[PDB]
Design a protein around this motif. Sequence first.
Motif, PDB file in Angstrom:
ATOM      1  N   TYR A  49     -17.021   1.733   4.738  1.00 51.32           N
ATOM      2  CA  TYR A  49     -18.124   2.677   4.880  1.00 51.32           C
ATOM      3  C   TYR A  49     -18.644   3.094   3.515  1.00 51.32           C
ATOM      4  O   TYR A  49     -19.804   2.829   3.172  1.00 51.32           O
ATOM      5  N   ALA A  56     -20.156   0.256   1.637  1.00 54.80           N
ATOM      6  CA  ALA A  56     -21.364  -0.234   2.285  1.00 54.80           C
ATOM      7  C   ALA A  56     -22.559   0.633   1.925  1.00 54.80           C
ATOM      8  O   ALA A  56     -23.702   0.163   1.934  1.00 54.80           O
ATOM      9  N   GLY A  57     -22.312   1.898   1.586  1.00 51.63           N
ATOM     10  CA  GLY A  57     -23.407   2.757   1.186  1.00 51.63           C
ATOM     11  C   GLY A  57     -23.718   2.654  -0.293  1.00 51.63           C
ATOM     12  O   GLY A  57     -24.874   2.788  -0.702  1.00 51.63           O
ATOM     13  N   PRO A  91     -25.792  -0.776  -2.550  1.00 51.85           N
ATOM     14  CA  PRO A  91     -27.240  -0.692  -2.800  1.00 51.85           C
ATOM     15  C   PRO A  91     -27.615   0.309  -3.877  1.00 51.85           C
ATOM     16  O   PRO A  91     -28.480   0.002  -4.707  1.00 51.85           O
ATOM     17  N   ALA A 108     -30.261  -0.058  -7.021  1.00 48.13           N
ATOM     18  CA  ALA A 108     -31.367   0.848  -7.295  1.00 48.13           C
ATOM     19  C   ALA A 108     -31.237   1.450  -8.684  1.00 48.13           C
ATOM     20  O   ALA A 108     -32.193   1.428  -9.469  1.00 48.13           O
ATOM     21  N   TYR A 117     -32.189  -0.885 -11.380  1.00 43.74           N
ATOM     22  CA  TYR A 117     -33.628  -1.071 -11.263  1.00 43.74           C
ATOM     23  C   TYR A 117     -34.368   0.084 -11.915  1.00 43.74           C
ATOM     24  O   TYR A 117     -35.286  -0.130 -12.716  1.00 43.74           O
ATOM     25  N   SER A 152     -41.640  -0.822  -0.852  1.00 46.93           N
ATOM     26  CA  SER A 152     -40.669  -0.903  -1.936  1.00 46.93           C
ATOM     27  C   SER A 152     -40.104   0.470  -2.270  1.00 46.93           C
ATOM     28  O   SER A 152     -38.893   0.622  -2.470  1.00 46.93           O
ATOM     29  N   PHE A 178     -37.668   1.579   0.474  1.00 46.45           N
ATOM     30  CA  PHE A 178     -36.340   0.987   0.369  1.00 46.45           C
ATOM     31  C   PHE A 178     -35.584   1.503  -0.848  1.00 46.45           C
ATOM     32  O   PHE A 178     -34.357   1.629  -0.801  1.00 46.45           O
ATOM     33  N   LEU A 238     -34.192   4.755   0.375  1.00 52.91           N
ATOM     34  CA  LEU A 238     -33.040   4.533   1.241  1.00 52.91           C
ATOM     35  C   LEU A 238     -31.806   4.151   0.433  1.00 52.91           C
ATOM     36  O   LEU A 238     -30.702   4.635   0.706  1.00 52.91           O
ATOM     37  N   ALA A 239     -31.974   3.287  -0.572  1.00 47.64           N
ATOM     38  CA  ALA A 239     -30.856   2.909  -1.428  1.00 47.64           C
ATOM     39  C   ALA A 239     -30.310   4.098  -2.209  1.00 47.64           C
ATOM     40  O   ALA A 239     -29.094   4.210  -2.390  1.00 47.64           O
ATOM     41  N   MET A 278     -28.610   6.670   0.895  1.00 39.43           N
ATOM     42  CA  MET A 278     -27.616   6.333   1.913  1.00 39.43           C
ATOM     43  C   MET A 278     -26.183   6.481   1.413  1.00 39.43           C
ATOM     44  O   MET A 278     -25.294   6.841   2.195  1.00 39.43           O
ATOM     45  N   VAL A 325     -23.547   8.802   3.499  1.00 44.16           N
ATOM     46  CA  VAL A 325     -22.362   8.306   4.187  1.00 44.16           C
ATOM     47  C   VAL A 325     -21.111   9.103   3.829  1.00 44.16           C
ATOM     48  O   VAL A 325     -20.152   9.116   4.605  1.00 44.16           O
ATOM     49  N   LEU A 348     -22.742   8.236  10.934  1.00 42.85           N
ATOM     50  CA  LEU A 348     -22.030   7.517   9.886  1.00 42.85           C
ATOM     51  C   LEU A 348     -20.702   8.189   9.566  1.00 42.85           C
ATOM     52  O   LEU A 348     -20.138   7.970   8.491  1.00 42.85           O
TER      53      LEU A 348
HETATM   54  C1  LIG Z   1     -23.378   2.972   5.679  1.00 47.27           C
HETATM   55  C2  LIG Z   1     -24.148   1.655   5.611  1.00 47.27           C
HETATM   56  C3  LIG Z   1     -25.467   1.793   4.865  1.00 47.27           C
HETATM   57  C4  LIG Z   1     -25.893   0.482   4.208  1.00 47.27           C
HETATM   58  C5  LIG Z   1     -26.965   0.677   3.139  1.00 47.27           C
HETATM   59  C6  LIG Z   1     -28.302   1.086   3.751  1.00 47.27           C
HETATM   60  C7  LIG Z   1     -29.406   1.258   2.705  1.00 47.27           C
HETATM   61  C8  LIG Z   1     -30.195  -0.029   2.478  1.00 47.27           C
HETATM   62  C9  LIG Z   1     -31.312   0.167   1.456  1.00 47.27           C
HETATM   63  C10 LIG Z   1     -32.036  -1.139   1.132  1.00 47.27           C
HETATM   64  C11 LIG Z   1     -31.106  -2.172   0.498  1.00 47.27           C
HETATM   65  C12 LIG Z   1     -31.715  -2.778  -0.764  1.00 47.27           C
HETATM   66  C13 LIG Z   1     -32.219  -1.693  -1.710  1.00 47.27           C
HETATM   67  C14 LIG Z   1     -33.037  -2.258  -2.870  1.00 47.27           C
HETATM   68  C15 LIG Z   1     -32.658  -1.603  -4.199  1.00 47.27           C
HETATM   69  C16 LIG Z   1     -33.805  -0.760  -4.766  1.00 47.27           C
HETATM   70  C17 LIG Z   1     -34.703  -1.565  -5.709  1.00 47.27           C
HETATM   71  C18 LIG Z   1     -36.178  -1.483  -5.300  1.00 47.27           C
HETATM   72  O1  LIG Z   1     -36.560  -0.583  -4.642  1.00 47.27           O
HETATM   73  O2  LIG Z   1     -37.077  -2.476  -5.702  1.00 47.27           O
HETATM   74  C19 LIG Z   1     -37.962  -2.876  -4.693  1.00 47.27           C
HETATM   75  C20 LIG Z   1     -37.372  -4.039  -3.905  1.00 47.27           C
HETATM   76  O3  LIG Z   1     -37.189  -3.633  -2.580  1.00 47.27           O
HETATM   77  C21 LIG Z   1     -36.622  -4.624  -1.774  1.00 47.27           C
HETATM   78  O4  LIG Z   1     -36.774  -5.764  -2.052  1.00 47.27           O
HETATM   79  C22 LIG Z   1     -35.804  -4.247  -0.539  1.00 47.27           C
HETATM   80  C23 LIG Z   1     -35.880  -5.326   0.539  1.00 47.27           C
HETATM   81  C24 LIG Z   1     -34.733  -5.244   1.546  1.00 47.27           C
HETATM   82  C25 LIG Z   1     -33.747  -6.403   1.377  1.00 47.27           C
HETATM   83  C26 LIG Z   1     -32.331  -6.030   1.828  1.00 47.27           C
HETATM   84  C27 LIG Z   1     -32.299  -5.575   3.291  1.00 47.27           C
HETATM   85  C28 LIG Z   1     -31.118  -4.649   3.592  1.00 47.27           C
HETATM   86  C29 LIG Z   1     -31.230  -4.000   4.972  1.00 47.27           C
HETATM   87  C30 LIG Z   1     -32.606  -3.391   5.219  1.00 47.27           C
HETATM   88  C31 LIG Z   1     -32.652  -2.554   6.495  1.00 47.27           C
HETATM   89  C32 LIG Z   1     -31.604  -1.448   6.510  1.00 47.27           C
HETATM   90  C33 LIG Z   1     -31.985  -0.268   5.622  1.00 47.27           C
HETATM   91  C34 LIG Z   1     -31.603   1.077   6.236  1.00 47.27           C
HETATM   92  C35 LIG Z   1     -30.219   1.056   6.873  1.00 47.27           C
HETATM   93  C36 LIG Z   1     -29.844   2.399   7.498  1.00 47.27           C
HETATM   94  C37 LIG Z   1     -28.331   2.591   7.585  1.00 47.27           C
HETATM   95  C38 LIG Z   1     -27.668   1.591   8.531  1.00 47.27           C
HETATM   96  C39 LIG Z   1     -39.253  -3.340  -5.351  1.00 47.27           C
HETATM   97  O5  LIG Z   1     -39.079  -4.667  -5.756  1.00 47.27           O
HETATM   98  P1  LIG Z   1     -40.237  -5.326  -6.724  1.00 47.27           P
HETATM   99  O6  LIG Z   1     -40.590  -6.696  -6.201  1.00 47.27           O
HETATM  100  O7  LIG Z   1     -39.708  -5.447  -8.131  1.00 47.27           O
HETATM  101  O8  LIG Z   1     -41.571  -4.349  -6.717  1.00 47.27           O
HETATM  102  C40 LIG Z   1     -42.607  -4.611  -5.806  1.00 47.27           C
HETATM  103  C41 LIG Z   1     -43.890  -4.878  -6.596  1.00 47.27           C
HETATM  104  N1  LIG Z   1     -43.899  -6.239  -7.101  1.00 47.27           N
END
Ligand SMILES: CCCCCCCC/C=C\CCCCCCCC(=O)O[C@H](COC(=O)CCCCCCC/C=C/CCCCCCCC)COP(=O)(O)OCCN
Lengths: 84, 88, 459, 63, 219, 124, 178, 70, 128, 104, 175, 55
Positions: C152, C155-156, C159, C163, C166, C191, C194, C197-198, C201, C205, C212
Amino acid sequence: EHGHSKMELPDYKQWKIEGTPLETVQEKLAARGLRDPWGRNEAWRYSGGFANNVSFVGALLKGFKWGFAAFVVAVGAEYYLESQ
Amino acid sequence: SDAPPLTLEAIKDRVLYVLKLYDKIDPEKLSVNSHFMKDLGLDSLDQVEIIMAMEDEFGFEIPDIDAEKLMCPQEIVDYIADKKDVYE
Amino acid sequence: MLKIIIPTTMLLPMTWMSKHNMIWINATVHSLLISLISLSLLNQLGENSLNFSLTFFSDSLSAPLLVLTTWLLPLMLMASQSHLSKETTTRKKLYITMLILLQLFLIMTFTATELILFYILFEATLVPTLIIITRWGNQTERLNAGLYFLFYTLAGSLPLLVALVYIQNTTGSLNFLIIHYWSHPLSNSWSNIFMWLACIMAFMVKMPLYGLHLWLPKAHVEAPIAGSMVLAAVLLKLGGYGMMRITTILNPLTNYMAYPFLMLSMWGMIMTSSICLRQTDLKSLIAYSSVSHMALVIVAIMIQTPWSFMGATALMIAHGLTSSMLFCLANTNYERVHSRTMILARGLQTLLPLMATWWLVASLTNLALPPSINLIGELFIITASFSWSNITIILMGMNMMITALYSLYMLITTQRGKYTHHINNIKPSFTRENALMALHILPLLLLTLNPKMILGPLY
Amino acid sequence: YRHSIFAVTHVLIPVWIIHYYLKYHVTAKPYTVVERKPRIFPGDTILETGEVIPLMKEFPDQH
Amino acid sequence: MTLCLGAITTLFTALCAITQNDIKKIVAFSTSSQLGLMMVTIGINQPHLAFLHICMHAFFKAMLFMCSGSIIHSLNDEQDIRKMGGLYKAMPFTTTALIIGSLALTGMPYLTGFYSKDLIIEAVNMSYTNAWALLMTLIATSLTAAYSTRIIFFAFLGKPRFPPLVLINENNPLLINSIKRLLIGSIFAGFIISNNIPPMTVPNTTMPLYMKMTALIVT
Amino acid sequence: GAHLARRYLGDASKEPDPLRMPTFPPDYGFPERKEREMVATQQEMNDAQLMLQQRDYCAHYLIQLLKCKRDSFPNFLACKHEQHDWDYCEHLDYVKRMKEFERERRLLQRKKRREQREAEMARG
Amino acid sequence: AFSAPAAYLTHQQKVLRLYKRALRHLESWCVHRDKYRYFACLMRARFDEHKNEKDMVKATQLLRQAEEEFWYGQHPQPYIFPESPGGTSYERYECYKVPEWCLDDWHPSEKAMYPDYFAKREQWKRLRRESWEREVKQLQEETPPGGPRTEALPPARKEGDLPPLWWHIVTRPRERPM
Amino acid sequence: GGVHIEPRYRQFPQLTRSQLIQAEFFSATMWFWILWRFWHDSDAVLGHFPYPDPSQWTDEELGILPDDED
Amino acid sequence: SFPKYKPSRLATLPATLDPAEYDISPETRKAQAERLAIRSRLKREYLLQYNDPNRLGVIEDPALIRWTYARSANIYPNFRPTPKTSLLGALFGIGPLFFWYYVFKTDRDKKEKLIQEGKLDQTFNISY
Amino acid sequence: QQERDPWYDWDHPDLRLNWGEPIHWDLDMYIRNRVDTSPTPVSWNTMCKHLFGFVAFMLFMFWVGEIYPSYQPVGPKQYPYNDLYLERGGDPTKEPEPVVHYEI
Amino acid sequence: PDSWDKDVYPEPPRRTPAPAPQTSLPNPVTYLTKIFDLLVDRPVTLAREFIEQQHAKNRYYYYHREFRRVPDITECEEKDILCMFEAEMQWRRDYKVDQEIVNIIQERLKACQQREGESYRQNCAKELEQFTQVSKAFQDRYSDLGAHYSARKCLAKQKQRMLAERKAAKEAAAA
Amino acid sequence: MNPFASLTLTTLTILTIPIMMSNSNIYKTNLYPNYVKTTVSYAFTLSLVPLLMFM
Ligand SMILES: CCCCCCCC/C=C\CCCCCCCC(=O)O[C@H](COC(=O)CCCCCCC/C=C/CCCCCCCC)COP(=O)(O)OCCN
Ligand SMILES: CCCCCCCCCCCCCCCCC[C@@H](O)O[C@H](CO[C@H](O)CCCCCCCCCCCCCCC)COP(=O)(O)OCC[N+](C)(C)C
Ligand SMILES: *OP(=O)(O)OCC(C)(C)[C@@H](O)C(=O)NCCC(=O)NCCSC(=O)CCCCCCCCCCC
């Protein structure tokens, strides 16, 4: 200091149904061919200091006589003192 | 409270006092060990009424399972003493 | 800040070079001295912070957490002295070493001025806790419990690390002072969603957020008493501290990204509270009550108002002390009865009256009786929520009632009624247990006299 | 005798402490002890100033 | 809303009290109905009258509870009124105290309860209010008289119905003095307090004769 | 109440509405219309700080009664004449209110009678 | 309470239990003693009019209509003795009852007070220690095979023996300990 | 702090003269107070100011004209 | 004849009103006898363990352990995803969240529109 | 648990349980401190009907009394200085419309 | 008392009536106050005089700290961190001072309400008006900034308010 | 100065002394109920004075 004085029970032959509402109950029961076997067990509730009752109105007017006498005396004194 | 510490003699005296006011039984015939059905010729309803009179006299209730098997004044006294923790 | 860090490190050689029969005495005395030293951090300013160096800084949000962390260690040592009697000297020293390493990691985590440093220590706190749970835990479920508590969390937090790096490639810094002074708005974008969320979360958690939270009852009921104390009192507040720190770069996205969590909290606090009404385990009940209180803290942080932040800080401190006391009371029953079932040992007020008084005071504090600081935090959060939306009072009000119910339920089942007839091994309470309860409860009632100390930086 | 010591230790000492605290610390700050303004009726006179409040308008009295 | 809540409370609680057999339950329902009457007084914009009623009710209700506790202790912790019979002569001081308290509770003139209950009833009678709430208040006053009658009748007037071992005893100075202080209070405090407080409302000087006597008539 | 029965069971328009009373000009009956006289001024009535509901046309008697109550403190039954005077003034105020009620009711009676007579003359 | 229960209640026991319940509720309805005496004699007359009946089927048809009539007119607030399970002082003194074994945990400075009491207590303990070893075997041989059929216990049959499982019945706390 | 009174067992309990005289005195006090207050302040019960008859007022003082003017 | 008593979930049937106690058969008596026998066996076991001078510990109750285990740890291995469980889980775990979201979102939209139009009268609203 | 026999010698008298006997899945719901299912002198449906009817009748009658209030045959209470304009709120720089009271 | 400024915390002249006994009965209140004076006020005063003379034997001082004015956020470059730090500290100090100003006005209002008695609605108009003005100004300055408030956000809020005011003024003038 | 405030605070304050003494030796004796009763009577007598001042 507690109550250890050897209380002795009264004589059971003392309790009689006569002169009580239990007598009327016995008469009504005999009008149907019945009897009350536990009648003398309750007679003490109508026998001694419990033999006399007071009405609700009599209960409310518990100290009316002395209070009325005192009020008469006080109002007479008030009249005899104001009229001076 | 201020309740005097009742004794076995007091319990026996009060039980016999209540029984002597039950006009169904002759005050000469009964004793502490005189049985209810056989010695005095009483019924089961009479026994229930006797138990109820005991309960009214002593201010507490005897459960039916225990009350149904109290067939002498002596066992009534013993039951009351055991319930109320009487020493002497 | 090294005046606190160096003695905490020196605790380890002092523990390992101690005599076989003098480990507890020395550890307790020197931990109390370190707590006295750390008391000086409470002198805060209305201005920026106590920026000691480039690496560590202190705030009126960090100072009460640091004081609580340093104060919890002697209490944990006292609580662990009993059930570790038949253990070899080396393993007792290893246990004390785990506790000291946890305290060191927490101390540094609260005062770290860099987000990456904070992440590293925030994760370093996991290893000692996992070892404590899975090594000195009693039942066979501990292994599974440990696994949950680990994954758990990870998993939080994996990400978040992404971030974080980044962010440092975009702003150029992860120092909190620079991050605060150079903050820029987050535009509504996928973007950015997400990234939000990163960043959120990992702290959600560990509060834990409702839905959670499955790891927490397992971990808390399977841990030894010191593990339960540190998990409920300090490790839960790491998520609150992290969310308080990181929300400065998440605006104005939080205005609408907070809706799913707020609901999950506002309804969640009801569910967990109702769960406490039907529970057959004391530790499980106390853990679920912790979940409800932390849901209120989550609402406070998401509302993002001054009164919300003040209430969240006060409630974090108050809940830490109260939950630690409740776990200690439950354990003092368990060490006599060895069951951990509420309805086994009954009518204990007749056999242990002073412990019954301790139970009453702990239940009253968990019930948020005014003017306890529990109620201060709860009321500030409720007022802020009412300003956020007048309808919230309904849910808040319901929670209050339910809380009282289960609190008094726990007090009535164990302390009142008739004693269990066949349980004949309930010995008089030791001076150690009474002193443990007194040292839990006196700081709470003392803190109610100076609430400004625990109201955070927005006071 | 017991009543005398009770009146000394349970009434006189607390009233001394409270009167000292109120007279020399609490009232040292503004608005700490705020009094309701005393009522003024026609025909009264003021200690501070010494003027006489005029009487009313001699309303027609009967029954 | 306050008016309607108070009216329904006082009616319902007096109605419940009218058939109770535990003496403490009767007095508790009496307290609840009196609180409902206080809320009725609040609803018609008479807060100082409600405060005065609080002050008078304190005296006479506390003394009533002390008399009930005296009876309970004297009858071996027995609380049911079915099992207490002739106590008017057996324990006279408790009898007089309870009689005076019941007369004060029912608003007997020139007693402590008069100066609050009578004024409250008059104020509710002459006010722009619900007809239903007014009717419920009057019926609740009647029921107050009724349950006071019930307590007195079943605790003092009949033949004894308690166990034969009589342990009745009033002769303790603590009980006598504690009851007597509140007896003097429930006799004189209404007069003293009403005459020593400043006027805080416009009086109801003129009233129809039948409207002035309504509380006494229903009692 | 009898007026409640009259308004609620009989003709509603035949009787005044207490909330909207009065509905007729003050000069409609007779043109004299002498004004009500107030004795206590604004300033002394504020200084006595009675209440905003005791600040009525009987306020001077209230002020005098309060002066008596304050002046003869230990003898709480010393000044009963001024209590009687204030009560009498309040009684007269209530009687004036009752007279207003009656006048409005009779004016409504007369207006409805005028309307009926006019309708009868129009229909004939 | 003291007597062991049976597997079922016979018809006579059920009838007697109805008689007692009905009389108690009639007393609760009839507050005064003379009224209760009259109506209780009437109820006794009503009860024994079918006393001599022989067949079981109708005798069971009666005592069913009797239960229905009782439940219709059962006085929803009957009189309860204060110590009875519904009374106002049912478990009032339950909080003052302390087990005897707690005295084993007293400090020696506490046991220094009351030396005679603790000497007598030691005598009782040694008596229990011997009697238990005798009682276990007595119960083992007195029990039918397959286990007990009723939770009734036997008395002692030898001279120095004690009734099996006597300790926690003899050492009851008290009815009013404090 | 009282005196000793033994139980009686089916007889009227023993009474002290002190409690009897005290109870009678307080009942007499209550009745005297009621009678005194009614004698001195009777308007508190029966009222002091008569209730006027609204239908008995003449139309002159109510501003009523004989149904023809206005 | 008298008006009948109608039992409910929260006001059960009296034992004296059960027809089952008036339908006596030998099989019923045998069932009652063996129920009493097993109760007596359990009572004897408990009382032998309870009166023993040597024992100085809480007596373990297998029934209590079974109760706690069934309430806590036997739940999931006996769980089966069925239409009833799926529907109840979806409702009880999702419906409240969206209900409260709708309520709060509507309230905050109303408040925000009122603020933007300026007709809210937030005078003296200093602390938030 | 409240409808279990109180005169039996339970091993746990307060809970009315015996050692070794199967425990109801919902024991903590029925512990004599919580919901009980004991038979009542009056049937559940009759009690529900009577209570609901009483409450509904009281609400309806309160609404009826709201529509048909009670009052006295009097006019409004009169206050001297423009209906106490200055003493009730104030605004002494607006010169309110004067309201004069009728002496009869 | 000289411990506070009478202008910052004003009070009316406090005119009190004179005793005008009307009867020959001695009132208990005066005697009770005389015995209270003799038994309480004298010993307390003597103890205070002793403590005050002990304090006079040892007299020393403390000072109010004066703060210089520094450039505000409206004259800081975009990334000039030192100027923003100084301006942020100055803005936070000003925020605290404004909070205390509001507190002073609220204390005035509460004291007026208690002092005026039954005529507080009319006799406390000035305090209510002052509190209304100060509350309006404080709400304009600092409301809705959030928990992460700063001088930059306050400047942004002021800029948006001035833009709205300018637009409204231009629209009204060009009506 | 103005004994009203001192008297009103003293009543509530001296109501609290037996609570402080609940850990002293008086609490372990049989004179504690009389101690509390006497304290309450004294508090009533003291509180009677501000009522006279208001009257
Ligand atoms: C207790 C379990 C919880 C698990 C974790 C839940 C949180 C998930 C958050 C997302 C995961 C990836 C975070 C990305 C890191 C941040 C970096 C960022 O924001 O850069 C973004 C990139 O953002 C992404 O690419 C994210 C895409 C997602 C890919 C991974 C998917 C993971 C699951 C997604 C759905 C679940 C999210 C919520 C879950 C809720 C809890 C279960 C911009 O990218 P650029 O291309 O450079 O700028 C755009 C302009 N050119
Ligand atoms: C399981 C226990 C609880 C764990 C914690 C739960 C908390 C996490 C919840 C995530 C928060 C919400 C995420 C996104 C919110 C943004 C708002 C958006 O979704 O709503 C509409 C978006 O419309 C639709 O939602 C489009 C996306 C639909 C597909 C997403 C899946 C929907 C349900 C999935 C839930 C699964 C969660 C668990 C994953 C394992 C708005 O319309 P639009 O103006 O156009 O978009 C605005 C955003 N812009 C500006 C960037 C363009
Ligand atoms: O000698 P005992 O052992 O005492 O036996 C007694 C008796 C013979 C009467 C009985 O045990 C018995 O065995 N009878 C055999 C036949 C029989 O009893 N059949 C059933 C008769 S039922 C009955 O008695 C009518 C009941 C009428 C009363 C209804 C109660 C309603 C009261 C309502 C509340 C006030």
